[PDB]
Amino acid sequence: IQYRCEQLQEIRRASQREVMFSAVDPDLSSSTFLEPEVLRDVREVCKLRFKFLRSLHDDSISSSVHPGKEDLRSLSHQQWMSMAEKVWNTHTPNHILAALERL
Amino acid sequence: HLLRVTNKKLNHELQSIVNGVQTLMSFFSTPETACELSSQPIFLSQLLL
Amino acid sequence: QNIQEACLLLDKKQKHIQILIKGNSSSKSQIRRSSVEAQKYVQDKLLPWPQE
């Protein structure tokens, strides 16, 4: 029981008012300002899923059902699932949602 | 005297389990009243949608 | 032929757009439902244990 409480307390602490989301003025190319990790991970998860959906879309439109593409789709889908899962394990739900808001 | 000590130990452990479980449950209780700033949601179902 | 083919393509794309629109509307409702299910589980099944 103590072990479980410690785990949830750690999550609460991590949730506390964290993740500065700088408004990326689009024009300001240069300032190397370092994207918060949560934002990068969420974006990447979302992009990966988008590319996957897009690929499904392009295929649906191009009617070329190459036989063998299903194995690769499943793998891609699994890859995203793993990534998505990782994102939810690594970051607090509060920060993920905040990242989604910004996106 | 040994059984009295053991009895105190057993009562302590039973209370520890009660305290431990109460603490654990505090993490799942949604702060109805907006006001209390302090309790940052820990569960995505808490919402924040 | 190209113009016709292209018109078909535009129509296919248009269909996908209509599907995605519906799909996203459904997903939004689902997210609301899924949120209500997790809260209901905590209230009905976990919160009563400390008293027992």
Angular region, C25: left φ>0, alpha ψ -120 to 50, beta rest: alpha
State which residue of chain A sits closest to C16, comparing Cα positions. A57
Is the separation of the CB atoms in A46 and A103 below 8 Å? Answer: yes
Q: How far is residue C50 CA from its own chain's centroid?
A: 36
Distance between CA A42 and CA A94 in Å, rounded?
12
- How near does any CA of chain B get to the CA of A5, in Å? 5
The residue type found at A82 is S
**CA dist B24 → A44, B21, B32, B41, C4 (Å):** 34, 5, 18, 14, 65
CA A91 to chain centre: 10
C27 close contact with B: CB closer than 8 A: no
SS3 of residue C26 by DSSP: helix
Set of chain B residues whose Cβ sits within 8 Å of the Cβ of A12: 27, 40, 42
Answer yes or no: are the C-beta atoms of A57 and A103 closer than 8 Å. Answer: no
Q: Which amino acid is at A18?
A: E
Nearest to A8 by CA among C2, B47, B40: B40
Q: Do A97 and B49 touch (CB under 8 A)?
A: yes
Asked if A97 lies within 8 A of B40 by C-beta distance, the reply is no
**What is the rounded CA–CA span in Å between residue B28 and residue B35?**
18
The sign of the torsion formed by the CA atoms of A91, A97, A101, A103 equals positive
Total residue count of chain A as it appears in this document: 103
Please state how this structure was obtained: cryo-EM
How many whole angstroms separate alpha carbon C21 and alpha carbon C9? 18
* Documented resolution in Å: 33.0
Nearest by Cα to A4 from C47, B25, C49: B25
Distance between the two ends of chain B, CA-based, in angstroms? 59
